[PDB]
Amino acid sequence: KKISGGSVVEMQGDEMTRIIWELIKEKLIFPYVELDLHSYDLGIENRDATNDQVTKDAAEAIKKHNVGVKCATITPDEKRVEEFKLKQMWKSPNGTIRNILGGTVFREAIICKNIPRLVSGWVKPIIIGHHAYQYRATDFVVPGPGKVEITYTPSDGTQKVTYLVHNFEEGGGVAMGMYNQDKSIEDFAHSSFQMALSKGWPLYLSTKNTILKKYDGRFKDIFQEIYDKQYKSQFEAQKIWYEHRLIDDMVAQAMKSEGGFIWACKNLGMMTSVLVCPDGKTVEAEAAHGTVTRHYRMYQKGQETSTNPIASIFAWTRGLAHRAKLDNNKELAFFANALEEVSIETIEAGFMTKDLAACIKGLPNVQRSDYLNTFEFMDKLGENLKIKLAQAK
Amino acid sequence: KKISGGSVVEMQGDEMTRIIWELIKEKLIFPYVELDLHSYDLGIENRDATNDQVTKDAAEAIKKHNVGVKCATITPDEKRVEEFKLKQMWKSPNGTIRNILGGTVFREAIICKNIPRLVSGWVKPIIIGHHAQYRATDFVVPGPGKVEITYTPSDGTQKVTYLVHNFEEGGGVAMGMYNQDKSIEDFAHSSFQMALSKGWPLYLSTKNTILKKYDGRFKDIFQEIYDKQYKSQFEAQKIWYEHRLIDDMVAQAMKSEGGFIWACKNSLGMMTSVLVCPDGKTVEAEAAHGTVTRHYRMYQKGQETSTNPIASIFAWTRGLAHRAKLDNNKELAFFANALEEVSIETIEAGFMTKDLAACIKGLPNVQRSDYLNTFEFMDKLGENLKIKLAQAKLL
Ligand SMILES: NC(=O)c1ccc[n+]([C@@H]2O[C@H](COP(=O)([O-])OP(=O)(O)OC[C@H]3O[C@@H](n4cnc5c(N)ncnc54)[C@H](OP(=O)(O)O)[C@@H]3O)[C@@H](O)[C@H]2O)c1
Ligand SMILES: NC(=O)c1ccc[n+]([C@@H]2O[C@H](COP(=O)([O-])OP(=O)(O)OC[C@H]3O[C@@H](n4cnc5c(N)ncnc54)[C@H](OP(=O)(O)O)[C@@H]3O)[C@@H](O)[C@H]2O)c1
Ligand SMILES: Cc1ccc2c(c1C)N(C(=O)Nc1ccc(C(C)(C)C)cc1)Cc1cccnc1N2
Ligand SMILES: Cc1ccc2c(c1C)N(C(=O)Nc1ccc(C(C)(C)C)cc1)Cc1cccnc1N2
Helix, strand or coil: CCEEEEEEEEEEHHHHHHHHHHHHHHHCCCCCCEEEEEEEEECCHHHCCCCCCHHHHHHHHHHHHHHHECCCCCCCCCCHHHHCCCCCCCHHHHHHHHHHHEEEEEECCCCCCCCCCCCCCCCCEEEEEEECCCCCCEEECCCCCEEEEEEEEEECCCEEEEEEEECCCCCEEEEEEEEEHHHHHHHHHHHHHHHHHHHCCCCCECCCCCCCCCCCCHHHHHHHHHHHHHHHHHHHHCCCCCEEEHHHHHHHHHHHHHHEEEECCCCCEEEEEEEEEECCEEEEEEEECCCHHHHHHHHHHHCCCCCCHHHHHHHHHHHHHHHHHHHHHHHHHHHHHHHHHHHHHHCCCCCCCHHHHHHHHHHHHHHHHCCCCCCHHHHHHHHHHHHHHHHHC | CEEEEEEEEEEEECHHHHHHHHHHHHHHHCCEEEEEEEEEEHHHHHHHCCCCCHHHHHHHHHHHEEEEEEECCCCCHHHHHHCCCCCCCCCCHHHHHHHHHHHHHEEEHHHHHHHHCCCCCCCCEEEEECCCCCCEEEEECCCEEEEEEEECCCCCCCCCCEEEEEECCCCCEEEEEEEEEEHHHHHHHHHHHHHHHHHCEEEEECCCCCCCHHHHHHHHHHHHHHHCCHHHHHHHHCCCEEEEEEHHHHHHHHCCCCHHHHEEECHHEEEEEECCCCCCCCCCEEECCCHHHHHHHHHHCCCCCCCCCCCHHHHHHHHHHHHHHHCCCCHHHHHHHHHHHHHHHHHHCCCCCHHHHHHHHHHHCHHHHHCHHHHHHHHHHHHHHHHHHHHCCCC
């Protein structure tokens, strides 16, 4: 028998990533895991045909079943409108999903010890998070001389404060009002603490509390208040810690570190993007790359392609590990981790796609024998996964 | 007989950079170029003794003489005030100079074929310049209530009110930001001037899809200034100006070979900072790093140092190249060019400081035999510059 995986929302996408997404299911997921699969086709022709209703239904399904795994999708522009003869310039599916779900986006690189890195000392992955909806900022044109003031009027009427933003004396310009609700800062803190707990790494928040004393100071304060009143014991029980750092000081210390921390910031086929909702229940994983149009155009002309599926595979493993965590499914938790180990071990043993071979040898030096095409790489992952799971019994 | 280099404003600085700066003058500039040198000592001690008046005078001299070359200076904090027994926590000399001159700062890395970078395809440098918010008005929203931003016209016409946010439950934070048209225009002029002098295309990146009014004014002003006064000059030089959304800009740059100016509305010894004034005549060149205090302490204790002088040498070469452009000085233009090529070529041939050796071999495997100390490196540049200039005499 296969592992009973439970309830998973799956989102199909476009171009080359749509092809490798089906190969991940066909060769790595379905031969070992049985799922109550809620599949939504977020392909550009389907989103056009349904007037983007499929994206909204897919977003509601993630809210209901707590686990979303998404394939890369085309965000329409004037060229795509002309290419597919679209009805509208459909909004980014990711934006629509994010708007309905809410949460914090965390990006994480997949580290293969034999693959070159910007900072060679980084041996453990760094996870970088930014809170999701400057979007809700009121900007405007100042047509000429005059004063721009910002006023705060409490609900009872009393303790009203007016601040001069600028007195324009020699002409016009622009001005804007920006805000941040406490709830959004608390959600950002929760998603960050819950992320650091599920990973088992220390958490660092970086602000500019020296430039924006009051604005960024409330981020530093809220994160500390939630840490002491709700997470300090859980962090100590997992030997990790939370600390705030100034961005200038944080960048400098990060270079001298070996990575392996969650980095909360106030302001390619080896990187994931995971939306972590404040509830600590709902997660949506996807590769942090696009649909790889250039490889898809080669595929369309009968040319052999060599597309890296690691980021797409890790969207499945991060989502399945989360599904296993919610359901206390030990066999699924094991599978999700074994698939990640196999992916890294295969590249570390020298079996990789052309892009990774180019990172090592340099593109002009890459020979056909230095890499595997899309299918051969998936088959090598499939053999190693069969072996790894057969050893585990 | 030395080159007549003309009028150049020079600013001396502090700690390790002050030492390197004197070696650059003594071994690479003075043996071949004679200048009507306007030197200002911006050392922490001199600024303290003169009550920062030296800084203001140096800034006025750059305005008058058009070319400034500056050594890195200590910006005081509470620890420096104790260390030097300063009368005040004097403002940053760069901030004082920028206040008097105006202009946009453009950073450009020095590329060496053997020194790794983010994208291997970037063979020509990318020059990035940001709009010169620190002057924003921020405050805490203690509880429920309305936050509005208003504009009262000076001509007595109707006051305009915008709702920033209505806090129905709980509080938060809020802020106001502004930008004057004149700064946006100055940013456009400095960027167009920078592109014309370098002979490279210019890209302005904004988030005009989100900040339709705020970033839309940057895009509109850059387009208006371009079409009405630079398009001809740009086409004549086979270059172009284009606005790009920050997302498309990051994508286009990754798949590029470098060689463009990037104005954006938002290893250290291998980057320069040039304050480019909107007039197209005034320029102030310096290294993007600081006074290298850690290295200075080692040098102070008689311990060997390996400090990268490239960024400081390029502050001089960019200023000399600007000077030659202003005076049509072909000999000074060739000299600045040759000093840049010697520096790059010396590194490329395996002669470099520890920081560069760490970029190729990785800090854990860098041996003493892989690099030259500060003095040994400067000597190697002096020796190669003499050879390059003698070989150039064959023209
Ligand atoms: N996750 C998402 O839903 C998402 C995010 C961004 C963009 N998009 C959409 O994607 C469409 C096309 O975007 P794009 O092709 O310019 O971006 P991209 O897919 O990220 O591809 C840019 C280049 O990066 C390399 N690359 C990226 N992913 C790779 C992988 N898995 N394996 C190997 N190489 C990989 C390829 O380099 P070479 O060309 O050298 O082979 C590729 O041509 C757009 O319409 C955009 O809206 C979707
Ligand atoms: N342009 C300016 O006038 C300016 C700008 C910033 C700061 N400063 C002033 O500089 C002083 C010291 O600041 P800081 O130590 O934080 O900054 P920094 O001087 O830029 O030095 C930081 C570190 O960067 C490396 N580094 C920088 N320049 C280098 C070079 N030319 N060659 C080799 N390594 C180099 C060294 O790393 P390792 O430790 O690995 O050797 C150095 O310790 C302060 O008093 C500050 O106010 C001046
Ligand atoms: C968005 C993102 C998220 C997570 C990661 C990355 C990126 C790109 N990576 C990276 O180099 N981030 C990075 C962080 C800071 C800098 C500074 C210090 C120059 C500001 C530069 C790059 C890839 C990388 C590799 C190994 C281990 N961790 C990572 N994590
Ligand atoms: C401040 C600065 C100015 C100029 C330069 C740089 C830096 C750091 N450099 C660089 O990597 N900038 C950079 C630009 C964009 C990105 C994105 C696309 C990832 C956002 C990342 C880095 C060094 C570099 C090397 C080769 C040629 N040009 C440059 N120019």
